[PDB]
């Protein structure tokens, strides 16, 4: 009998445009079909009587900005999610920032923050307890970024210095500085977590340790190299791992961004899960899950491209 049950989905990236491809032309992007997959996920979550949904970001594509349709695209996906009739928690990813400024995002339906939060500090991160002995933490992986901060701000300048110290492709910072190894991550479509944000995460986890809570952490960007392609990792992913490895309360770290997905268990026992992306899923397939938190284990039931997973608690 589960303590708590929630839906999970990543990288819907809806747009009312014809199918496209990724840069390397190795994956197709099913922009319109994403809304059909989202509608079906919602139907399934309704049957399951889920208590909330967490969506891992890139809910609408940056192409919407280029066709001046950002608001109508967001309306479309919000209408599908509203049909579920439960709280939806929204992680902000790179495509959110391509479409909207932070003040716009804060005033929008994508602000699910309303535990503790960092909104007053201009960081979109928050934590709450959905059920006894469990805690959810949503992180802002574009806290340090050039795409999610205002030109001339302290944080944008800091982020630009970090990015361009590692990536000399000033003419197109979406191109990685190398083709092999972890330095690929230093691209404009990624970001990192500020010292302020990490100090807060570390504090949340210390308190969770002492309360014997199990903590689930959600981020648009993955942080463990075993769980995602290096080009998809947070800029300071190792700083995050160092925090997680310090705390037995960490149950799992769940991310989107790498549409291929990935998963692994850290040497600490913490599970990293990178959800397969809806946008690169064809209509004959699927990509979403429902997670069940029991007193002794978490079971994730995946559909289509997402495989099931069970985490037995330490
Ligand atoms: Zn994406
Ligand atoms: Zn820094
Ligand atoms: Zn550096
Ligand atoms: Zn992304």
Tab-separated table of C-alpha atoms and ligand atoms in Angstrom:
chain	number	residue	atom	x	y	z
A	1	UNK	CA	0.000	0.000	0.000
A	2	UNK	CA	1.763	3.226	-1.212
A	3	UNK	CA	2.346	6.269	1.003
A	4	UNK	CA	2.288	8.588	-2.020
A	5	UNK	CA	1.787	8.294	-5.793
A	6	UNK	CA	2.845	10.859	-8.418
A	7	UNK	CA	3.157	11.214	-12.202
A	8	UNK	CA	6.489	12.031	-13.943
A	9	UNK	CA	7.145	13.344	-17.454
A	10	UNK	CA	10.001	15.203	-19.191
A	11	UNK	CA	10.641	17.400	-22.224
A	12	UNK	CA	7.152	17.613	-23.762
A	13	UNK	CA	8.507	20.547	-25.846
A	14	UNK	CA	5.170	21.144	-27.575
A	15	UNK	CA	4.929	23.441	-30.607
A	16	UNK	CA	2.325	23.790	-33.347
A	17	UNK	CA	4.880	23.155	-36.108
A	18	UNK	CA	5.897	20.304	-38.414
A	19	UNK	CA	8.219	17.574	-37.138
A	20	UNK	CA	11.895	18.493	-37.002
A	21	UNK	CA	15.199	16.956	-35.973
A	22	UNK	CA	17.978	17.590	-33.499
A	23	UNK	CA	21.181	19.412	-34.608
A	24	UNK	CA	23.103	16.215	-35.412
A	25	UNK	CA	20.030	14.891	-37.326
A	26	UNK	CA	20.031	11.608	-35.393
A	27	UNK	CA	16.731	12.131	-33.560
A	28	UNK	CA	13.326	13.301	-34.802
A	29	UNK	CA	11.317	15.881	-32.831
A	30	UNK	CA	7.566	15.272	-32.801
A	31	UNK	CA	6.359	18.759	-31.840
A	32	UNK	CA	2.602	18.358	-32.359
A	33	UNK	CA	2.504	14.703	-31.217
A	34	UNK	CA	3.887	15.705	-27.823
A	35	UNK	CA	0.469	17.076	-26.839
A	36	UNK	CA	-1.160	13.710	-27.740
A	37	UNK	CA	1.347	11.855	-25.547
A	38	UNK	CA	0.777	14.380	-22.725
A	39	UNK	CA	-3.041	13.969	-23.033
A	40	UNK	CA	-2.695	10.180	-22.793
A	41	UNK	CA	-0.327	10.382	-19.782
A	42	UNK	CA	-2.917	12.608	-18.056
A	43	UNK	CA	-5.690	10.111	-18.820
A	44	UNK	CA	-3.575	7.340	-17.233
A	45	UNK	CA	-2.648	9.442	-14.154
A	46	UNK	CA	-6.337	10.220	-13.636
A	47	UNK	CA	-7.205	6.491	-13.594
A	48	UNK	CA	-4.366	5.929	-11.128
A	49	UNK	CA	-5.740	8.701	-8.817
A	50	UNK	CA	-2.158	10.250	-8.611
A	51	UNK	CA	-1.669	12.811	-5.820
A	52	UNK	CA	0.434	15.182	-7.966
A	53	UNK	CA	2.513	15.360	-11.133
A	54	UNK	CA	6.109	16.565	-11.507
A	55	UNK	CA	7.176	17.617	-14.992
A	56	UNK	CA	10.877	18.031	-15.563
A	57	UNK	CA	10.909	21.094	-17.860
A	58	UNK	CA	11.145	22.022	-21.528
A	59	UNK	CA	7.323	21.826	-21.558
A	60	UNK	CA	7.145	24.004	-24.707
A	61	UNK	CA	9.804	24.339	-27.405
A	62	UNK	CA	11.917	27.456	-27.943
A	63	UNK	CA	10.668	27.362	-31.561
A	64	UNK	CA	7.459	28.879	-30.205
A	65	UNK	CA	9.356	32.142	-29.538
A	66	UNK	CA	10.581	32.136	-33.145
A	67	UNK	CA	6.962	31.914	-34.381
A	68	UNK	CA	5.707	34.373	-31.751
A	69	UNK	CA	3.418	31.715	-30.242
A	70	UNK	CA	4.909	31.218	-26.746
A	71	UNK	CA	1.724	32.132	-24.832
A	72	UNK	CA	-0.642	30.017	-26.957
A	73	UNK	CA	1.740	27.038	-26.816
A	74	UNK	CA	1.906	27.272	-23.033
A	75	UNK	CA	-1.908	27.564	-22.911
A	76	UNK	CA	-2.160	24.353	-24.911
A	77	UNK	CA	-0.034	22.252	-22.568
A	78	UNK	CA	-1.542	23.834	-19.431
A	79	UNK	CA	-5.025	22.881	-20.680
A	80	UNK	CA	-3.901	19.234	-20.992
A	81	UNK	CA	-2.343	19.241	-17.513
A	82	UNK	CA	-5.314	20.985	-15.856
A	83	UNK	CA	-7.512	18.025	-16.871
A	84	UNK	CA	-5.609	15.892	-14.311
A	85	UNK	CA	-7.228	17.847	-11.427
A	86	UNK	CA	-4.208	17.647	-9.073
A	87	UNK	CA	-1.192	19.813	-8.251
A	88	UNK	CA	1.446	19.884	-10.982
A	89	UNK	CA	5.012	20.852	-10.087
A	90	UNK	CA	6.955	22.535	-12.864
A	91	UNK	CA	10.735	22.405	-13.239
A	92	UNK	CA	12.206	25.178	-15.431
A	93	UNK	CA	14.542	24.036	-18.210
A	94	UNK	CA	16.380	25.695	-21.093
A	95	UNK	CA	13.297	25.926	-23.350
A	96	UNK	CA	11.357	27.798	-20.676
A	97	UNK	CA	14.128	30.417	-20.721
A	98	UNK	CA	14.190	30.560	-24.528
A	99	UNK	CA	10.491	31.511	-24.402
A	100	UNK	CA	10.187	33.605	-21.227
A	101	UNK	CA	12.125	35.867	-18.876
A	102	UNK	CA	12.269	34.969	-15.148
A	103	UNK	CA	9.748	37.675	-14.191
A	104	UNK	CA	7.430	36.261	-16.890
A	105	UNK	CA	7.939	32.733	-15.627
A	106	UNK	CA	7.327	33.828	-12.027
A	107	UNK	CA	3.968	35.412	-12.972
A	108	UNK	CA	2.951	32.367	-15.065
A	109	UNK	CA	1.177	29.014	-14.556
A	110	UNK	CA	4.694	27.463	-14.508
A	111	UNK	CA	5.416	28.917	-11.062
A	112	UNK	CA	4.369	26.027	-8.814
A	113	UNK	CA	6.382	27.229	-5.790
A	114	UNK	CA	3.398	29.310	-4.496
A	115	UNK	CA	8.840	23.789	3.341
A	116	UNK	CA	10.894	26.731	2.052
A	117	UNK	CA	11.816	28.340	-1.246
A	118	UNK	CA	14.414	30.626	-2.792
A	119	UNK	CA	12.035	32.843	-4.818
A	120	UNK	CA	12.871	35.869	-2.625
A	121	UNK	CA	16.501	35.290	-3.631
A	122	UNK	CA	15.613	35.164	-7.377
A	123	UNK	CA	16.229	31.376	-7.596
A	124	UNK	CA	13.372	29.104	-8.668
A	125	UNK	CA	13.878	26.315	-6.153
A	126	UNK	CA	11.632	25.023	-3.420
A	127	UNK	CA	10.986	22.091	-1.146
A	128	UNK	CA	7.944	20.593	0.544
A	129	UNK	CA	6.735	17.420	2.167
A	130	UNK	CA	3.960	15.699	0.135
A	131	UNK	CA	3.553	12.825	2.638
A	132	UNK	CA	4.901	11.749	6.046
A	133	UNK	CA	8.667	10.976	5.975
A	134	UNK	CA	9.110	12.201	2.362
A	135	UNK	CA	10.415	15.451	0.974
A	136	UNK	CA	10.502	16.840	-2.591
A	137	UNK	CA	13.101	19.389	-3.658
A	138	UNK	CA	12.906	21.176	-7.022
A	139	UNK	CA	16.151	22.784	-8.167
A	140	UNK	CA	16.946	25.623	-10.570
A	141	UNK	CA	19.653	24.279	-12.904
A	142	UNK	CA	19.804	27.665	-14.754
A	143	UNK	CA	20.506	29.673	-11.600
A	144	UNK	CA	23.948	30.131	-13.110
A	145	UNK	CA	23.316	30.499	-16.848
A	146	UNK	CA	23.555	32.981	-19.662
A	147	UNK	CA	20.103	32.082	-21.018
A	148	UNK	CA	18.226	32.470	-17.700
A	149	UNK	CA	19.816	35.642	-16.300
A	150	UNK	CA	19.698	39.300	-17.472
A	151	UNK	CA	22.632	40.776	-19.356
A	152	UNK	CA	24.822	42.911	-17.033
A	153	UNK	CA	23.507	41.260	-13.837
A	154	UNK	CA	26.128	39.907	-11.442
A	155	UNK	CA	24.907	36.364	-11.988
A	156	UNK	CA	24.837	36.615	-15.805
A	157	UNK	CA	28.377	38.057	-15.820
A	158	UNK	CA	29.590	35.308	-13.460
A	159	UNK	CA	27.922	32.627	-15.625
A	160	UNK	CA	29.306	34.086	-18.868
A	161	UNK	CA	32.823	34.066	-17.372
A	162	UNK	CA	32.459	30.387	-16.315
A	163	UNK	CA	31.041	29.361	-19.709
A	164	UNK	CA	33.608	31.235	-21.826
A	165	UNK	CA	36.517	30.079	-19.638
A	166	UNK	CA	35.646	26.548	-20.774
A	167	UNK	CA	34.167	27.247	-24.214
A	168	UNK	CA	35.937	29.475	-26.721
A	169	UNK	CA	33.253	29.095	-29.425
A	170	UNK	CA	32.060	32.687	-28.826
A	171	UNK	CA	30.270	32.742	-32.200
A	172	UNK	CA	28.032	29.839	-31.090
A	173	UNK	CA	28.247	28.760	-27.469
A	174	UNK	CA	25.771	25.886	-28.100
A	175	UNK	CA	28.694	24.069	-29.754
A	176	UNK	CA	30.682	22.113	-27.155
A	177	UNK	CA	34.379	22.974	-26.695
A	178	UNK	CA	35.406	19.312	-27.160
A	179	UNK	CA	33.794	16.218	-28.713
A	180	UNK	CA	34.813	13.776	-25.951
A	181	UNK	CA	34.748	13.791	-22.144
A	182	UNK	CA	32.974	15.820	-19.461
A	183	UNK	CA	34.057	19.272	-20.753
A	184	UNK	CA	31.335	18.904	-23.417
A	185	UNK	CA	28.887	20.148	-20.753
A	186	UNK	CA	30.144	23.742	-21.022
A	187	UNK	CA	27.557	24.918	-23.529
A	188	UNK	CA	24.980	27.737	-23.514
A	189	UNK	CA	22.029	25.328	-23.261
A	190	UNK	CA	23.254	24.142	-19.842
A	191	UNK	CA	23.712	25.887	-16.523
A	192	UNK	CA	24.717	25.409	-12.941
A	193	UNK	CA	23.685	25.828	-9.320
A	194	UNK	CA	24.832	28.872	-7.320
A	195	UNK	CA	26.705	28.521	-4.027
A	196	UNK	CA	23.592	30.021	-2.387
A	197	UNK	CA	21.395	27.317	-3.927
A	198	UNK	CA	23.809	24.496	-2.990
A	199	UNK	CA	24.081	25.741	0.608
A	200	UNK	CA	20.285	25.630	0.849
A	201	UNK	CA	20.054	22.137	-0.695
A	202	UNK	CA	22.763	20.964	1.738
A	203	UNK	CA	20.786	22.450	4.680
A	204	UNK	CA	17.509	20.836	3.533
A	205	UNK	CA	19.300	17.476	3.358
A	206	UNK	CA	20.910	17.832	6.807
A	207	UNK	CA	17.477	18.409	8.313
A	208	UNK	CA	16.034	15.487	6.305
A	209	UNK	CA	18.824	13.220	7.639
A	210	UNK	CA	17.868	14.017	11.217
A	211	UNK	CA	14.149	13.664	10.525
A	212	UNK	CA	14.792	10.310	8.789
A	213	UNK	CA	13.058	11.585	5.673
A	214	UNK	CA	13.584	10.191	2.176
A	215	UNK	CA	14.292	12.998	-0.262
A	216	UNK	CA	13.522	13.114	-3.967
A	217	UNK	CA	15.330	15.854	-5.894
A	218	UNK	CA	14.201	17.154	-9.279
A	219	UNK	CA	16.303	19.193	-11.715
A	220	UNK	CA	16.043	19.875	-15.443
A	221	UNK	CA	19.714	18.882	-15.731
A	222	UNK	CA	21.303	15.575	-14.687
A	223	UNK	CA	24.417	15.623	-12.488
A	224	UNK	CA	25.789	12.049	-12.545
A	225	UNK	CA	27.935	11.107	-15.569
A	226	UNK	CA	26.579	7.494	-15.402
A	227	UNK	CA	23.024	8.768	-15.886
A	228	UNK	CA	23.319	11.050	-18.930
A	229	UNK	CA	25.452	12.012	-21.901
A	230	UNK	CA	28.291	14.381	-20.797
A	231	UNK	CA	26.911	17.153	-23.041
A	232	UNK	CA	23.760	17.206	-20.891
A	233	UNK	CA	25.337	17.589	-17.423
A	234	UNK	CA	25.076	20.665	-15.185
A	235	UNK	CA	28.114	22.925	-15.311
A	236	UNK	CA	29.013	22.227	-11.678
A	237	UNK	CA	27.573	18.712	-11.548
A	238	UNK	CA	30.407	17.486	-9.276
A	239	UNK	CA	29.530	20.164	-6.686
A	240	UNK	CA	26.006	18.704	-6.593
A	241	UNK	CA	27.300	15.124	-6.280
A	242	UNK	CA	29.506	16.193	-3.368
A	243	UNK	CA	26.419	17.500	-1.527
A	244	UNK	CA	24.285	14.418	-2.317
A	245	UNK	CA	27.003	11.985	-1.200
A	246	UNK	CA	27.082	13.715	2.221
A	247	UNK	CA	23.468	12.799	3.003
A	248	UNK	CA	21.825	9.425	3.589
A	249	UNK	CA	18.372	11.020	3.169
A	250	UNK	CA	18.805	11.284	-0.616
A	251	UNK	CA	16.582	8.699	-2.304
A	252	UNK	CA	16.877	9.767	-5.923
A	253	UNK	CA	17.835	12.583	-8.237
A	254	UNK	CA	15.457	12.867	-11.199
A	255	UNK	CA	16.194	14.938	-14.279
A	256	UNK	CA	15.155	15.472	-17.912
A	257	UNK	CA	17.148	17.291	-20.643
A	258	UNK	CA	18.914	14.237	-22.073
A	259	UNK	CA	16.025	12.977	-24.231
A	260	UNK	CA	17.705	9.554	-24.601
A	261	UNK	CA	17.347	9.017	-20.824
A	262	UNK	CA	19.702	7.186	-18.479
A	263	UNK	CA	19.910	5.744	-14.977
A	264	UNK	CA	22.451	4.517	-12.452
A	265	UNK	CA	23.059	4.040	-8.750
A	266	UNK	CA	25.844	6.147	-7.227
A	267	UNK	CA	28.392	4.430	-4.936
A	268	UNK	CA	26.465	6.172	-2.090
A	269	UNK	CA	23.312	4.175	-3.003
A	270	UNK	CA	21.410	7.202	-4.332
A	271	UNK	CA	19.563	6.499	-7.564
A	272	UNK	CA	19.929	8.874	-10.524
A	273	UNK	CA	17.144	8.812	-13.079
A	274	UNK	CA	17.148	10.768	-16.331
A	275	UNK	CA	13.726	10.525	-17.939
A	276	UNK	CA	13.424	9.819	-21.660
A	277	UNK	CA	12.014	12.873	-23.440
A	278	UNK	CA	8.508	13.055	-24.863
A	279	UNK	CA	9.633	15.290	-27.728
A	280	UNK	CA	11.824	12.580	-29.303
A	281	UNK	CA	9.155	9.884	-28.795
A	282	UNK	CA	7.137	8.942	-31.951
A	283	UNK	CA	3.346	8.475	-31.815
A	284	UNK	CA	3.728	4.674	-31.822
A	285	UNK	CA	5.727	4.888	-28.581
A	286	UNK	CA	5.471	6.749	-25.221
A	287	UNK	CA	7.552	8.294	-22.442
A	288	UNK	CA	6.187	8.939	-19.001
A	289	UNK	CA	5.948	7.236	-15.641
A	290	UNK	CA	4.092	6.951	-12.362
A	291	UNK	CA	6.063	6.612	-9.146
A	292	UNK	CA	4.854	4.846	-6.036
A	293	UNK	CA	6.504	5.578	-2.677
A	294	UNK	CA	6.059	2.742	-0.197
A	295	UNK	CA	7.446	2.449	3.315
A	296	UNK	CA	10.288	0.188	2.106
A	297	UNK	CA	10.802	0.955	-1.606
A	298	UNK	CA	9.937	3.232	-4.488
A	299	UNK	CA	8.536	1.662	-7.654
A	300	UNK	CA	8.495	3.609	-10.904
A	301	UNK	CA	6.179	2.254	-13.610
A	302	UNK	CA	7.348	3.506	-17.001
A	303	UNK	CA	5.625	3.428	-20.370
A	304	UNK	CA	7.099	3.050	-23.822
A	305	UNK	CA	10.693	4.299	-23.802
A	306	UNK	CA	10.783	4.562	-19.972
A	307	UNK	CA	11.675	1.262	-18.246
A	308	UNK	CA	10.355	0.371	-14.775
A	309	UNK	CA	12.679	0.789	-11.798
A	310	UNK	CA	12.547	-0.208	-8.142
A	311	UNK	CA	14.665	1.427	-5.432
A	312	UNK	CA	14.877	-0.563	-2.203
A	313	UNK	CA	15.464	1.819	0.713
A	314	UNK	CA	18.744	1.775	2.665
B	1	LIG	ZN1	14.485	19.113	-23.941
B	2	LIG	ZN1	30.892	30.065	-9.948
B	3	LIG	ZN1	35.346	26.367	-14.373
B	4	LIG	ZN1	16.557	20.818	-21.988
